[PDB]
Write a protein that binds this ligand. Structure first.
Ligand code: HEM
Ligand code: HEM
Ligand code: HEM
Ligand code: HEM
Lengths: 142, 146, 146, 142
């Protein structure tokens, strides 16, 4: 679980890097589809799932808007992310083993873009937070 | 594992430009902070209870450099990685009792530190080849476990 | 994987006494209840929204029997399991898009259903050999994934 | 997270099988040390870590007493298992990757001993509960 120290560290990191939310999402999703090709099938209804796609860029803005929502709802991620859990479990049927894949891609992207801010201390609290995000997104699965 | 010429070229280029003395200490210290239960194997390395502690310890630095150079044997003959780590796997299992899930944790820290060094040059294709290499080494380090 | 004669004898004895028509339907139905996101691959198998539903479906039963017989090729030549599932791995990846973590989930359900059938005869040594066999098959099913 | 349905299912299963708590613990720990030998090192200070050991039998009673405590504390496993999390993280330094191993061994043992009660419906709620137990035991690790 997230301590007061973890919550403050996640809020302070997002306060610094959130300006680049859209770019972080485009790059994280781009990486996920290329590096973990099992995930591409979930986006295959889009007209373009190739590198540089405007669909991947548009969806990356939404994904990091879900992360920004999770930072706002950090005191109660289950209730805050319930609708997104229902969407991924029931409407999309995304296998829940994939949440940790996108979380790793998000950490890699933040590391590439914000090497000074993404210290080991920022990383431990953000990783605990993304584990909590994955568990909240897993709420409606079983 | 099967390797494409492009993957071989990417891995070779990464290692040719790697500053081991920078990445190695950073990767191991990052693992000791993010997955702090890994500190119990290096409790004789000196003072460690905090992150400024861990980051600056010269023992941790020298050991992170040794770990990163432990990748060299694999990158120099990627078709034989499984048999290139047998003795290292035996050491970590039987002498050091390192739990095997920990190899993947350190692997991810190595990737995250290289990503911070390379910045936009750490493309998706670069990440894919590097993670495929580290996964092969992690599998080989777990090979002698029972 | 390396096999001892005792492991070979245990695996052979398990398969020789296996009632596939009992264990197969139970193992797959148990997976569909415990890891219900695995139901999305069999949405044409008929009615499934509930557990009495899943348990009694003859399509699920016939498919669980097919899965369990899919272990036969591996148990008949355990030294070649990696190459005995290539075509099955390709089918589950490219045609069926089954996510690879799911093979381990079904594997654990097969073990739990066999444990309920065997009772006290499911000793630790029996569990160890059977799980080592299933892990080899799970690795081979994930072999053709990218 | 555990729903009211999951909590009732776990309480009803433990109400039926708790009579054999001691035996379940001896068998689960026995299996863990034999099947996952990386775990034996943690018990090596005992005078006997071989099959049939009276030390494994005595500790198995304690382990299932921790599971019984978790059933009582099912509404708030973090607070209920905090002392046991501190013990495994700080005093024992058990790598947290091992909790899922013992949880699987507990499911196997219950299946061997209570095949009628351990239905798929009992199993989904108990597995979600043991995941919650592992996350509560992980509380003091980072
Ligand atoms: C950090 C974890 C994740 C977050 C925060 C997240 C967030 C979101 C959000 C905010 C949306 C928009 C929902 C709406 O339309 O109202 C969405 C949709 C979607 N997500 Fe995720 N998601 C995550 C992980 C994943 C993963 C791992 C995958 C697949 C591998 C996935 C696949 C999808 C798909 C297919 C859609 C629908 C796309 C469409 O509308 O065409 N998500 N996600
Ligand atoms: C997966 C990537 C890893 C690589 C390539 C690797 C490499 C090595 C190398 C090359 C050695 C020195 C060989 C020798 O002692 O003769 C070593 C020793 C050591 N490694 Fe690893 N290692 C890795 C992961 C880990 C992790 C995950 C841990 C613990 C969390 C660990 C703990 C140790 C310890 C305790 C020693 C001995 C330290 C001492 O001399 O005091 N290693 N490692
Ligand atoms: C890991 C153990 C597994 C084994 C040994 C295995 C075995 C097989 C066998 C032998 C077939 C039939 C071959 C054919 O179609 O020509 C098959 C098909 C199938 N399997 Fe698996 N399988 C396993 C796991 C899984 C899991 C985990 C899933 C999904 C969660 C899955 C989903 C399917 C589906 C969707 C089909 C086709 C069903 C149809 O015909 O409608 N399998 N499997
Ligand atoms: C279901 C998960 C687990 C539960 C509920 C649990 C419960 C307990 C309890 C109740 C004790 C006694 C604490 C005391 O002395 O007051 C304990 C001690 C201990 N546990 Fe666990 N435990 C779990 C998992 C593990 C795992 C996975 C391992 C190692 C692989 C482990 C290793 C130990 C050790 C080494 C001790 C101390 C033994 C001694 O006093 O000699 N535990 N556990």
């Amino acid at each position: 679980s997230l301590s007061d120290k973890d919550k403050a560290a996640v809020r302070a990191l997002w306060s610094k890097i959130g300006k680049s939310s859209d770019a972080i999402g485009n790059d994280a999703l781009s990486r996920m589809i290329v590096v973990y090709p099992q995930t591409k099938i979930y986006f295959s209804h889009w007209p373009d799932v190739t590198p540089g796609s405007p669909n991947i860029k548009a969806h990356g803005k939404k994904v990091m808007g879900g992360i920004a929502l999770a930072v706002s709802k950090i005191d109660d991620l289950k209730t805050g992310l319930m609708e997104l859990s229902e969407q991924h479990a029931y409407k999309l049927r995304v296998d829940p083993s994939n949440f940790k894949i996108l979380n790793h891609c998000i950490l890699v992207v933040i590391s590439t873009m914000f090497p000074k801010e993404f210290t080991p201390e920022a990383h431990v609290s953000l990783d605990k937070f993304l584990s909590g995000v994955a568990l909240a997104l897993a709420e409606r699965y079983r | 594992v099967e390797w494409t010429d492009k993957e071989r070229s990417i891995i070779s280029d990464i290692f040719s430009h790697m500053d081991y003395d920078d990445i190695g200490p950073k990767a191991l210290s990052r693992c000791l902070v993010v997955y702090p239960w890994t500190q119990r194997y290096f409790s004789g390395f000196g003072n460690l209870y905090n992150a400024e502690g861990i980051m600056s310890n010269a023992n941790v630095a020298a050991h992170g450099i040794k770990v990163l150079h432990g990748l060299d044997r694999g990158m120099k003959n990627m078709d034989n990685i499984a048999d290139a780590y047998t003795d290292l796997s035996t050491l970590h299992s039987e002498k050091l009792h390192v739990d095997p899930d920990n190899f993947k944790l350190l692997s991810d820290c190595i990737t995250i530190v290289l990503a911070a060094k390379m910045g936009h040059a750490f493309t998706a294709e670069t990440q894919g080849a590097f993670q495929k290499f580290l996964a092969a080494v992690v599998s080989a380090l777990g090979k002698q476990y029972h």
